[PDB]
Symmetry: C2
Subunit: 105 residues, 2 copies
């Protein structure tokens, strides 16, 4: 399952909850076609990889978070670990996403 970040305080709580695990955050919009296409794949990844935490942020719901993170394309995947930004991926490229997960987890 992919947890939807509710606000900025919630984002910090989730990053804390993740512990030492790589966190992958999907910045998406409900009007974004590629976002919807890849969402089930993220759910499957979320279900199967126990050493990675998957989150999602609806940019229309958390516009402050989208701005703070300089989102321009949907979907954007942010890769964090122990509160540090490790990488970013713009677009629904599942292979590159998987590669960044394997590289950073």
């Amino acid at each position: 399952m992919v947890y939807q970040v509710k606000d900025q305080e919630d984002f910090t709580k989730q990053l804390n909850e993740a512990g030492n695990k790589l966190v992958v955050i999907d910045f998406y919009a409900t009007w974004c076609g590629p976002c919807k296409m890849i969402a089930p794949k993220l759910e499957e990844l979320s279900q199967s990889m126990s050493d990675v935490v998957f989150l999602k942020v609806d940019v229309d719901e958390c516009e402050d978070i989208a701005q703070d993170n300089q989102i321009a394309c949907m979907p954007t995947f942010l890769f964090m670990k122990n509160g540090q930004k490790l990488d970013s991926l713009s677009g629904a490229n599942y292979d590159k996403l998987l590669e960044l997960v394997e590289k950073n987890k």
Copy 2:
């Protein structure tokens, strides 16, 4: 002038009012850095080019319109004439925008 589209009906009304003119639509978000970066240049261009209609759509206000046009990367510039799609440009590239206006005006 760059007019802000209020909803789907308003979008249709503006497309009709353009008559035979090229219409350029900027799909943007208020949390989008490059969007804000290029907005003043679009405003300047619109004040000069009276034979081209310039519109803008806030994807947060008009999510339905965003979905209709398959917006992914922002800002997206859609080029239309007589209600029909001519071209599309993702990202804030001013030279490419001018090339596409020159091509389609």
